[PDB]
Amino acid sequence: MFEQRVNSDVLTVSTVNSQDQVTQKPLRDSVKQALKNYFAQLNGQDVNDLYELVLAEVEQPLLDMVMQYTRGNQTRAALMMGINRGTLRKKLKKYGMN
Amino acid sequence: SDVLTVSTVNSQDQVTQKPLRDSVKQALKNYFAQLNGQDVNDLYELVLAEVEQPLLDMVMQYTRGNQTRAALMMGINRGTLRKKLKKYGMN
DNA sequence: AAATTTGTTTGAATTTTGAGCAAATTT
DNA sequence: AAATTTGCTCAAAATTCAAACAAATTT
């Protein structure tokens, strides 16, 4: 009855394929492409903060959307994210979301 | 200005970058719409896993398997990196 | 007026980190 | 044969957590 939906297919993104046809592709892939392209642009100095660099690109929209979803309610937001309300507050502070 | 971007195409077949974060926003918007008021639980772990995997998958690839250079590039402890690779069974 | 959330502290649990070392691998 | 990296400890620095609670706010 229920068809399997794999973890990679929970968060997806509309793409266009070789037959100009609209289709969903994992968010995983977006991150792949973003980095593939990042690396090309390194001609060719050193990086020492690639994790933080990425993590910020991703924490921001996530907090944004979840706060929109909970209409500003931090308690529910932290709950639905699976983190302490304290860490959420501090994250939001980090990104000036307050 | 933005270092992490992805390629889009419009109806005029023009390719054009957009920040990764925009993709992330889209994904979540779509996610939330799909679930009609079912409750979400470990959404942070969810997104993190979906992002940490393709990141490790690519730094390793770029450092040709070298954990040490990988960990330095990312800005995290080699120990931490090992832990993450085991967490996603990529080792 | 009740119920819930916020803003904040406190201290314990967990995670990350740096450093050190023989063994293995790469150069 | 030298240099680097790995796999593994140890403990200590940092971050995350839960549990308060009054004051504020939302219902």
From Swiss-Prot, chain B:
Region of interest called Required for the stimulation of HIN-mediated recombination, as start-end residue ranges on this chain: 10-37
DNA-binding region per Swiss-Prot/TrEMBL record: 67-86
TM helices/strands, residue ranges: none
Keyword Chaperone: no
GO CC list: cytosol; invertasome; nucleoid; nucleosome; protein-DNA complex
Predominant localisation class: cytoplasm
Annotated compartments: Cytoplasm, Nucleoid
Any one biological process term the GO annotation gives: provirus excision
Gene3D superfamilies assigned to the protein according to its UniProt record, in alphabetical order: Homeodomain-like (1.10.10.60)
GO molecular function terms listed in the Swiss-Prot or TrEMBL record: core promoter sequence-specific DNA binding; DNA binding; DNA-binding transcription activator activity; DNA-binding transcription repressor activity; protein homodimerization activity; sequence-specific DNA binding; sequence-specific DNA binding, bending; transcription cis-regulatory region binding
Assembly, per entry: Homodimer.
PANTHER family reported in the protein's UniProt record: DNA-BINDING PROTEIN FIS
NCBIfam families, A to Z: PRK00430.1
Family recorded in the similarity comment: Belongs to the transcriptional regulatory Fis family.
Role this protein plays: Activates ribosomal RNA transcription, as well other genes. Plays a direct role in upstream activation of rRNA promoters. Binds to a recombinational enhancer sequence that is required to stimulate hin-mediated DNA inversion. Prevents initiation of DNA replication from oriC. Binds to hundreds of transcriptionally active and inactive AT-rich sites, approximately half its binding sites are in non-coding DNA, which only accounts for about 10% of the genome.
Name this polypeptide is given: DNA-binding protein Fis
